[PDB]
Amino acid sequence: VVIEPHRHAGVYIARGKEDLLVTKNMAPGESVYGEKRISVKVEYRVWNPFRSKLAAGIMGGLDELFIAPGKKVLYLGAASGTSVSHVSDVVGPEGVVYAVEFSHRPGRELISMAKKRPNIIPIIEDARHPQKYRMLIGMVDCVFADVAQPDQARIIALNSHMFLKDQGGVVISIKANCIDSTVDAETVFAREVQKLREERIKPLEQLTLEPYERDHCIVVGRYMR
Amino acid sequence: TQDSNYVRTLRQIELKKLEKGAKQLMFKSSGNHTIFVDSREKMNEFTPEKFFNTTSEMVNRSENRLTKSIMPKESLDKKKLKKFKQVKQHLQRETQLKQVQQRMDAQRELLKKGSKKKIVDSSGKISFKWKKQRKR
C-alpha cells in the first residue's frame, strides 16, 4: 500500500501486498490495456517487465535512463501503446513522445491511445526514412529503439543524426536473433555496441534482462558530436 | 468427450489464474550488467558508487537503487513467499491437468475408427500408429 519513488521520477515501486513496479497516470481514471491500477486518492498504472521492454531494463537497473520527467522522447519501435503509455506517464504532460512505426496493423491502437493522451503523437512511417517526417518534429532529448530489424544501428544512427540534440541519450533494445542466430548473445552484443560507437554514441551500459527476455540486451549511450 | 471437456476447462481456469497471477508479481532480475569506461585506471578502480551510492543497502539488489509497515520483520516476507508458492502450485496443477487431458485425448482419438497397431517402445510406453489411409 506504500508507494516509494525510483531513481527516475514518474517511476515508482508500489510496495505492500505485492512489491511491484508502477508509473503515474496521464490518462485520468482508466487503464489502456488491462494493466492493474493502484490508487494511493491518486491513480497509478502497473508496468510489466514481461509485457514491455523498457520496464525490464529498469528492473535490471538502468541508472541514467535518459527517459526522465523533464524531456521529450522519440520511440522508434512500440507498434502499440503498451510501452509508450508508460513513457508518456513518466515524461508527464510537460513533454512529448513521438511514437514512430511502419506496420499500420497495430498503428490503429497506437493512434487510438494517442487520441486519449496528447503526450503521444504518432508517426506511421518507417524509421529508416526520417526525412519523410522531417516536417513533423525535430531535436528530441532521448531516442528509444525497439526495432527488431537487422539494421538497428543504421536506423537509429540516421534518426539520431537527424533528430537528437547533442549529449542526449540513446536507449536501444537489441534482439540477438534478428541480427545473427546460432552465435551467442555476448558476441552479437559486443558487435552491436562497437557498431553503435562507430557512430557518435559513447556506450555507457548494456544489460541482458535475462529473466524477462531470452537473448536480449538494452544498451544506453550518450550522443557525442 | 464430456469428461475431457471437464478436465480441459479446469486446465483453462488454472492457465488463466497462472498468467494473471504471474502478471502481478515481481521477479528479481539476473542480468549481466556491463559498464564501459576510460583508459585503464577507471577499470582498475572500484566503480566508486557510480550508481550504488551506498555499498551496504543500495548496491547489490538492482530493482531500485537510490540517490539520497505492518510487522515488516517477517509478516510481509511470509506473505510474499506464500504468493510465490501459490503461483508455483497453480503451475503444478496446470501441468498435471495438461497431462491427464492429454492421456484422455489419446484414448478418445484411439477409439474413433481406422486401422491402427499397438507400437511398443524400449520402456513400455505404448503408442498407437495409424495406417496411412486418408478419410473417405
Partner: peptide, 27 residues
C-alpha cells in the same frame, strides 16, 4: 557531513530493510 551522511544511511537502512530478505532470498 555527519548530520547528512548519518541521516542518509539511517533513511537508506529504514527503506531498504523493509523490502529485502535474508533466508527467504534463496527460497
Amino acid at each position: 557531513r555527519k548530520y547528512l551522511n548519518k541521516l542518509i544511511k539511517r533513511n537508506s537502512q529504514n527503506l531498504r530493510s523493509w523490502d529485502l530478505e535474508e533466508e527467504v532470498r534463496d527460497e
